[PDB]
Amino acid sequence: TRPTIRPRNDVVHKQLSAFGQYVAEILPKYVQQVQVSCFNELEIFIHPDGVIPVLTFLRDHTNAQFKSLADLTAVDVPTRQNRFEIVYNLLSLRFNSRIRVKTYTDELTPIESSVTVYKAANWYEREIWDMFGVFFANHPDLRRILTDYGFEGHPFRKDFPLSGYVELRYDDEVKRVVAEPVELAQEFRKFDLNSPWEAFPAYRQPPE
Amino acid sequence: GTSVKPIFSRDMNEAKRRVRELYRAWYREVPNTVHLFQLDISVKQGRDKVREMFMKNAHVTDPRVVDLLVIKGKMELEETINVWKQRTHIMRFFHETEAPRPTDFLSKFYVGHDP
Amino acid sequence: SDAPPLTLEAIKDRVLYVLKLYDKIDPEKLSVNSHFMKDLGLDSLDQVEIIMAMEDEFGFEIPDIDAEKLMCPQEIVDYIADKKDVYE
Amino acid sequence: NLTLNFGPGVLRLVMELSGEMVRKCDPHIGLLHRGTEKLIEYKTYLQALPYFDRLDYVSMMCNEQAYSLAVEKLLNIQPPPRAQWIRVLFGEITRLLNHIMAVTTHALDIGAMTPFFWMFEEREKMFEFYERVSGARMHAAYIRPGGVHQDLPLGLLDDIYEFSKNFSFRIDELEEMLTNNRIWRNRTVDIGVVTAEDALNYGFSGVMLRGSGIQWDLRKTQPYDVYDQVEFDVPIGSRGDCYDRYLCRVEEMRQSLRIISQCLNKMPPGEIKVDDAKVSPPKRAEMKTSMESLIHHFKLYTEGYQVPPGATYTAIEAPKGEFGVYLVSDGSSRPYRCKIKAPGFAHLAGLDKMSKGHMLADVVAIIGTQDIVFGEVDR
Amino acid sequence: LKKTTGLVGLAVCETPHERLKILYTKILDVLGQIPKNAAYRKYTEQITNEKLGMVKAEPDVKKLEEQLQGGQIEEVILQAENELSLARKMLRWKPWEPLVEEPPANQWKWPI
Numbered sequence: 001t002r003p004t005i006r007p008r009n010d011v012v013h014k015q016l017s018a019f020g021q022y023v024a025e026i027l028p029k030y031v032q033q034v035q036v037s038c039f040n041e042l043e044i045f046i047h048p049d050g051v052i053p054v055l056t057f058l059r060d061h062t063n064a065q066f067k068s069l070a071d072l073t074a075v076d077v078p079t080r081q082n083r084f085e086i087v088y089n090l091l092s093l094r095f096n097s098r099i100r101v102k103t104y105t106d107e108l109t110p111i112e113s114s115v116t117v118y119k120a121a122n123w124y125e126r127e128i129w130d131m132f133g134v135f136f137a138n139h140p141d142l143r144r145i146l147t148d149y150g151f152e153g154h155p156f157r158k159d160f161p162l163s164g165y166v167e168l169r170y171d172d173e174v175k176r177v178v179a180e181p182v183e184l185a186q187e188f189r190k191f192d193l194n195s196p197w198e199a200f201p202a203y204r205q206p207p208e
Numbered sequence: 209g210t211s212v213k214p215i216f217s218r219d220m221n222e223a224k225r226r227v228r229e230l231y232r233a234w235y236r237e238v239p240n241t242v243h244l245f246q247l248d249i250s251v252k253q254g255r256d257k258v259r260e261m262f263m264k265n266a267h268v269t270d271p272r273v274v275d276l277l278v279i280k281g282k283m284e285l286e287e288t289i290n291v292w293k294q295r296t297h298i299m300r301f302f303h304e305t306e307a308p309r310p311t312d313f314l315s316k317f318y319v320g321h322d323p
Numbered sequence: 324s325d326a327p328p329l330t331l332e333a334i335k336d337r338v339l340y341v342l343k344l345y346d347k348i349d350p351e352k353l354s355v356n357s358h359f360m361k362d363l364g365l366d367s368l369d370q371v372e373i374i375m376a377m378e379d380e381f382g383f384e385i386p387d388i389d390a391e392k393l394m395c396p397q398e399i400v401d402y403i404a405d406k407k408d409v410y411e
Numbered sequence: 412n413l414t415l416n417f418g419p420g421v422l423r424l425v426m427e428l429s430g431e432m433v434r435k436c437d438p439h440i441g442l443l444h445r446g447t448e449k450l451i452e453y454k455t456y457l458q459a460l461p462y463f464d465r466l467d468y469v470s471m472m473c474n475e476q477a478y479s480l481a482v483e484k485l486l487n488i489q490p491p492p493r494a495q496w497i498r499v500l501f502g503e504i505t506r507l508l509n510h511i512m513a514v515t516t517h518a519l520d521i522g523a524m525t526p527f528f529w530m531f532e533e534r535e536k537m538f539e540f541y542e543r544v545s546g547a548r549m550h551a552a553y554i555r556p557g558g559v560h561q562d563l564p565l566g567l568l569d570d571i572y573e574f575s576k577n578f579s580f581r582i583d584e585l586e587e588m589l590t591n592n593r594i595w596r597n598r599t600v601d602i603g604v605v606t607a608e609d610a611l612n613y614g615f616s617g618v619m620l621r622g623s624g625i626q627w628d629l630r631k632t633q634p635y636d637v638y639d640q641v642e643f644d645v646p647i648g649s650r651g652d653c654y655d656r657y658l659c660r661v662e663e664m665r666q667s668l669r670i671i672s673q674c675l676n677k678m679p680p681g682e683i684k685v686d687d688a689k690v691s692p693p694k695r696a697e698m699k700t701s702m703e704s705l706i707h708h709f710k711l712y713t714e715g716y717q718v719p720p721g722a723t724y725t726a727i728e729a730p731k732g733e734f735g736v737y738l739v740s741d742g743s744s745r746p747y748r749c750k751i752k753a754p755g756f757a758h759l760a761g762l763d764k765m766s767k768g769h770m771l772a773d774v775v776a777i778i779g780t781q782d783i784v785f786g787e788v789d790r
Numbered sequence: 791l792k793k794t795t796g797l798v799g800l801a802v803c804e805t806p807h808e809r810l811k812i813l814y815t816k817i818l819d820v821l822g823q824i825p826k827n828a829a830y831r832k833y834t835e836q837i838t839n840e841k842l843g844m845v846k847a848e849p850d851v852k853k854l855e856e857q858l859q860g861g862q863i864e865e866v867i868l869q870a871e872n873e874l875s876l877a878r879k880m881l882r883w884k885p886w887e888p889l890v891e892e893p894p895a896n897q898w899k900w901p902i
């Protein structure tokens with residue numbers, strides 16, 4: 001491992017693995033998986049019903065005190081029965097550590113709002129609802145935050161087209177801005193960049 | 209089988225009741241929207257547009273979809289009442305600038321290749 | 324308090340007049356015992372609109388729970404009288 | 412109790428006021444939502460790099476650095492030492508630029524408007540530094556996931572030294588105009604007071620933490636590049652109001668000067684991008700003489716490098732707070748998902764609680780002390 | 791005694807040893823109702839007994855702050871109250887029970 005390769009830290013790896021097993025032992029009702037990545041990032045995969053308990057634990061336990069919510073977001077994977085995965089990034093200042101909590105939902109299953117655990121979640125949840133269509137139960141005021149008023153659809157979904165469905169212009173007959181079906185003078189050029197000849201043998205999937 | 213978590217309604221009747229409440233609220237609001245935005249439409253055609261937008265989704269037989277639609281309609285009503293929309297947003301429901309599209313087979317044959 | 328008391332004859336006249344002004348029910352077909360669904364060909368939304376017309380004609384509010392069972396003008400008159408405490 | 416709609420960088424604000432006091436203040440955003448995160452999924456990693464220039468467009472190279480660090484972590488490579496030193500030097504220059512903009516815009520909105528010109532002359536000089544190193548004044552695209560694009564020109568360090576040795580007097584003139592002024596103090600003291608626990612729970616970061624007395628700074632607790640090789644102090648507030656945050660920002664300007672001096676003296680020799688042609692493009696002469704170099708140039712500029720599958724959350728101490736990226740790779744040359752975490756998002760979400768029981772004229776001060784740019788808030 | 795802990799909104803506590811003892815005894819009392827086999831009960835009991843012995847074996851405040859590894863005894867008290875609230879809520883939640891249900895077959899499979 002000469003100067004072009006990123007150095008690795010075994011002590012942090014061991015510490016994060018130990019804390020992951022600790023968390024899993026404490027909350028076996030909700031934890032389904034624990035992982036530590038090769039660049040020393042710990043993630044915990046939980047059942048959706050445990051969003052409020054688990055987070056509360058990680059915020060209030062003396063051995064965790066993850067008091068900061070760094071980020072809350074969603075990822076859309078159409079091939080899964082539960083389309084959306086919800087990712088919470090937490091920072092602990094007492095122990096100078098970071099953790100990630102993942103759960104899942106589909107287009108019709110509500111997720112509990114975590115504003116009672118972290119005040120920062122409020123706008124984040126709004127953003128998720130705006131961009132993916134995930135509903136959060138018991139949210140103080142859930143509504144659109146990024147899209148235009150009356151905008152239809154959720155643009156961060158994979159099946160949503162890049163340029164959308166409508167475009168805006170000014171019309172002098174009705175003397176106002178109007179929305180019309182989108183027409184592009186130059187269509188966006190789709191590129192097929194992926195090569196054959198797989199790059200990484202370590203991630204090869206079984207040929208099933 | 210196929211047990212699922214509710215959003216708001218346990219069955220179809222509760223969803224229908226929520227739909228009726230939302231429709232009542234929109235019907236009450238329409239004249240205020242017409243006056244306050246200084247629109248050029250009548251109250252009658254505003255309420256007709258509300259009815260049409262409700263009837264567009266009349267084929268749904270799933271309570272979760274129905275009350276998600278009700279949540280979205282309540283969001284739209286809140287946007288309208290608080291005058292967060294402009295006149296352009298309100299007028300977008302009517303497509304007064306879009307050219308009429310013929311549903312006839314011959315006309316679509318004449319204009320282009322689109323079925 | 325010298326105003327004349329309200330009577331079921333006046334209640335029926337007012338309810339029938341609001342029915343007449345409703346543009347989807349022609350006067351020649353409606354009766355006090357006519358039924359909104361089959362006798363007049365109306366769905367739930369026209370019934371709701373008629374209920375709101377009653378609400379702003381009789382100057383009070385009608386909860387949705389008991390507004391969904393009024394299906395003929397006669398029982399609408401009955402409900403108005405019951406909430407109004409009249410004798411005749 | 413009336414309602415006011417202060418609409419059209421650009422912000423819409425819907426507030427209820429009873430008399431002069433602010434009872435409720437709801438910001439409406441999205442007027443600069445460009446759909447950056449969806450657009451990034453249609454680009455290679457190199458093609459996606461220039462969007463981070465436009466995210467927070469007062470601190471360009473810092474966003475560049477955060478994105479580059481995330482991609483480097485996913486690629487399991489490391490930049491050469493000289494690239495790291497150049498990155499930290501230009502990150503501190505960018506911190507100076509951002510802090511000048513924040514403080515002088517705050518003062519201009521309050522009504523001072525002279526230090527704006529006084530310090531925008533210095534801002535123009537640092538724009539000259541940007542242009543000499545990259546060819547562009549602000550949207551530089553200089554810091555890449557393999558290091559930096561190009562080495563410094565032969566006389567740049569001397570001019571950076573000449574500039575940095577006179578900047579403390581400009582800061583001193585700023586403080587003479589603002590620090591002890593009774594009107595400025597009356598506009599800033601005890602305005603927008605936030606407690607430490609509320610700041611932690613509301614997701615605040617950076618100065619919005621340190622003004623309340625929280626001893627936290629990502630360059631000290633979770634150092635990246637060569638930061639652990641430079642010494643500096645972290646200014647800490649005591650009352651958690653606008654005045655303490657202004658003092659903290661001025662002190663961070665001074666500490667940035669200190670770090671820049673250290674960076675100038677310990678700049679090492681060597682290459683400036685990783686010596687791995689499957690990630691960093693070869694030199695032009697090598698491209699024009701060697702077969703492997705031509706092939707790797709062609710493939711890197713058409714397909715791009717593949718990143719092994721996985722997800723990272725990488726955060727840096729940007730001049731406005733913790734700036735983060737959640738980057739998800741599916742194994743191809745295009746990112747599967749890129750979520751951008753901007754501190755101004757949480758700060759603007761906390762604006763409502765920060766402005767409780769204040770005057771209408773105090774909301775402007777709170778907005779200025781939050782250091783909001785809507786490019787990063789809306790994305 | 792000191793003044794101005796340094797965090798806005800965190801008041802200085804006079805007589806923090808008695809407050810710490812009361813909070814730790816309340817935490818142990820609440821933990822007593824949790825099943826013995828629960829990992830949360832045994833782990834938190836270990837931590838709380840360690841801290842209680844630490845505060846019972848040290849009259850000095852600065853040396854206690856150095857020994858407790860928390861620093862600023864006021865935020866130690868704040869963390870003790872947070873632990874008490876979590877203990878009550880976790881008694882209500884009962885998360886020592888087995889997993890509610892398994893995820894679908896390929897819910898966490900990445901890539902694709």
Ligand SMILES: CCCCCCCCCCCC(=O)SCCNC(=O)CCNC(=O)[C@H](O)C(C)(C)COP(=O)(O)O
Pocket residue numbers: 224227234241254257258261262263265266267268269274277278281284298301366367368
């Ligand atoms: C001025 C511009 C105004 C804009 C208008 C905004 C419109 C808001 C969007 C509408 C919200 C929805 O889709 S609400 C979702 C609609 N609800 C359903 O589809 C349930 C199943 N269908 C039925 O129950 C009947 O067909 C039905 C006719 C609906 C009821 O009449 P009856 O029970 O008697 O039979």
